[PDB]
Amino acid sequence: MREYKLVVLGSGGVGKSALTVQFVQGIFVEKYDPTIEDSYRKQVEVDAQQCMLEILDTAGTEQFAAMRDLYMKNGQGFALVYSITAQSTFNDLQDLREQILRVKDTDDVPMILVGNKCDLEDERVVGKEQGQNLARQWSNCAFLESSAKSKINVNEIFYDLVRQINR
Ligand SMILES: Nc1nc2c(ncn2[C@@H]2O[C@H](COP(=O)(O)OP(=O)(O)NP(=O)(O)O)[C@@H](O)[C@H]2O)c(=O)[nH]1
Numbered sequence: 805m806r807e808y809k810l811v812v813l814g815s816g817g818v819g820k821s822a823l824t825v826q827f828v829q830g831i832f833v834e835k836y837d838p839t840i841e842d843s844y845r846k847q848v849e850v851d852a853q854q855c856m857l858e859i860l861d862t863a864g865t866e867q868f869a870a871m872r873d874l875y876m877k878n879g880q881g882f883a884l885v886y887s888i889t890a891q892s893t894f895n896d897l898q899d900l901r902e903q904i905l906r907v908k909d910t911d912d913v914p915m916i917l918v919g920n921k922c923d924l925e926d927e928r929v930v931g932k933e934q935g936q937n938l939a940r941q942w943s944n945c946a947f948l949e950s951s952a953k954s955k956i957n958v959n960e961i962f963y964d965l966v967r968q969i970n971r
């Protein structure tokens with residue numbers, strides 16, 4: 805069983821914790837309690853192998869960007885999450901992507917772009933094609949739309965990072 809160091813990051817309120825807790829506990833967290841930093845270890849199976857996932861659930865609201873440097877250096881795969889209902893959270897993604905690539909000093913890092921809250925179609929402001937096209941611009945990055953609430957594409961976020969790391 806191999807270890808995989810995964811990092812969930814993105815701006816405040818996008819559902820990083822809701823996705824992570826849905827994945828780990830199978831429960832949807834309705835409260836919005838801002839994260840400082842939480843970590844989970846979970847044994848899962850991907851492609852018929854036991855995998856030990858270390859999942860870092862990070863703060864969306866940081867005092868300064870350099871707070872993220874260490875977990876970027878240590879992380880092997882990154883789920884960059886925005887909310888399809890929150891324009892600013894999509895806008896914020898480029899800084900985060902660039903910071904990962906700078907800190908890890910490389911062009912190619914396992915990553916998936918996640919448009920969360922896809923159950924809130926009435927409130928959608930980020931189009932699906934918009935998200936797909938950003939992922940494409942990011943050197944054909946993986947992309948999905950998820951819902952922690954409706955349990956859509958939650959496991960797939962983490963499984964896809966494992967598969968990327970295995971390449
Ligand atoms: N309808 C819906 N609501 C959601 C989804 N994900 C999260 N939420 C809700 O959005 C709010 C913020 O979620 P949360 O997981 O705390 O976001 P976060 O990205 O971890 N915030 P922070 O960066 O401060 O830690 C919560 O009220 C949560 O229930 C989703 O897929 N659909």
Ligand SMILES: [Mg+2]
Binds near residue numbers: 822839861862863
């Ligand atoms: Mg959180």
